[PDB]
Amino acid sequence: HWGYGKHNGPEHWHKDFPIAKGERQSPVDIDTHTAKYDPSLKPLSVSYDQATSLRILNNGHAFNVEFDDSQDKAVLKGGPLDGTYRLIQFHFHWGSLDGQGSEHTVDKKKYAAELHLVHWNTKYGDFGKAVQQPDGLAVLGIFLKVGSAKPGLQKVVDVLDSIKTKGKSADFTNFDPRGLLPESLDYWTYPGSLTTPPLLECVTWIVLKEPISVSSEQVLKFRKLNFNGEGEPEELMVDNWRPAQPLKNRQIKASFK
Ligand SMILES: *c1c(C=O)cccc1-c1ccc(S(N)(=O)=O)cc1
Ligand SMILES: NS(=O)(=O)c1ccc(-c2cccc(C=O)c2)cc1
Numbered sequence: 001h002w003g004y005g006k007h008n009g010p011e012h013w014h015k016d017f018p019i020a021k022g023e024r025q026s027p028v029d030i031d032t033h034t035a036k037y038d039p040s041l042k043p044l045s046v047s048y049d050q051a052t053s054l055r056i057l058n059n060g061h062a063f064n065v066e067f068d069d070s071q072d073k074a075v076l077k078g079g080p081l082d083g084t085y086r087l088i089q090f091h092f093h094w095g096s097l098d099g100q101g102s103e104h105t106v107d108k109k110k111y112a113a114e115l116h117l118v119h120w121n122t123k124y125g126d127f128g129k130a131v132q133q134p135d136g137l138a139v140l141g142i143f144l145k146v147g148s149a150k151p152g153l154q155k156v157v158d159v160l161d162s163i164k165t166k167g168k169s170a171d172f173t174n175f176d177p178r179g180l181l182p183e184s185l186d187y188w189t190y191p192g193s194l195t196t197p198p199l200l201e202c203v204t205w206i207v208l209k210e211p212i213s214v215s216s217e218q219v220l221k222f223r224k225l226n227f228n229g230e231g232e233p234e235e236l237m238v239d240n241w242r243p244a245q246p247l248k249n250r251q252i253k254a255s256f257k
């Protein structure tokens with residue numbers, strides 16, 4: 001089916017997901033000189049103190065760390081958002097080389113990877129309903145640059161050997177996602193979409209200004225994962241990113257000057 005190869009990648013997706021050519025597609029390039037500071041944007045409220053991680057899964061496109069979203073345990077509020085968004089999972093997109101891998105770009109700069117913390121608007125009851133709504137999701141996006149190691153990422157790196165191939169999962173309880181954040185919560189925000197099929201236009205994107213630093217060894221271990229299932233020819237899971245899409249009739253707002 002769809003993927004990231006030459007024969008099933010982002011240039012092909014529109015044939016089965018025509019919204020790929022829609023009016024609010026993600027990711028986008030963040031032109032920092034064209035984004036407008038909005039002094040009415042509130043601070044983000046990230047409340048992960050009670051987060052309950054469950055499992056890590058290689059789904060053939062990335063790996064997801066999944067959370068208990070049956071109660072308000074780990075929630076995102078504030079910023080541009082109305083209402084409460086529950087954390088359901090996080091995942092990454094990354095490159096084959098340190099100079100590429102992020103989906104969003106900043107003044108056309110690509111980061112080595114991008115973390116997506118996916119939340120859904122609790123007024124819609126469940127995630128499947130939320131993705132059908134224009135304000136159903138809020139994804140907190142965080143850039144990764146290669147430099148010093150991120151201690152809060154190491155527990156994720158440690159377990160990747162056990163989920164090398166598509167369909168493999170492992171217990172991943174008691175993981176604190178607060179260890180994945182930068183110091184500052186300054187952000188850009190704009191209305192967009194899922195960056196993989198079904199490409200639904202349901203996401204308020206909140207992209208942090210400050211990248212996190214991860215070590216070359218940490219991202220190298222990302223690149224040892226496999227797109228393929230066990231017993232199939234090995235295809236390294238690398239370059240699972242969609243390139244920047246036309247901004248069209250949208251304005252990116254900044255919470256900071
Ligand atoms: C995730 C699930 C299940 O966890 C189901 C359908 C779609 C997605 C999805 C979530 C987030 C994104 S992203 N790259 O954060 O925009 C793409 C697909
Ligand atoms: N969902 S999509 O991006 O439009 C898509 C789905 C399936 C294919 C496909 C199907 C069968 C064989 C091949 C081999 O290249 C590719 C190629 C593209």
Ligand SMILES: [Zn+2]
Pocket residue numbers: 091092093116195
């Ligand atoms: Zn993503």
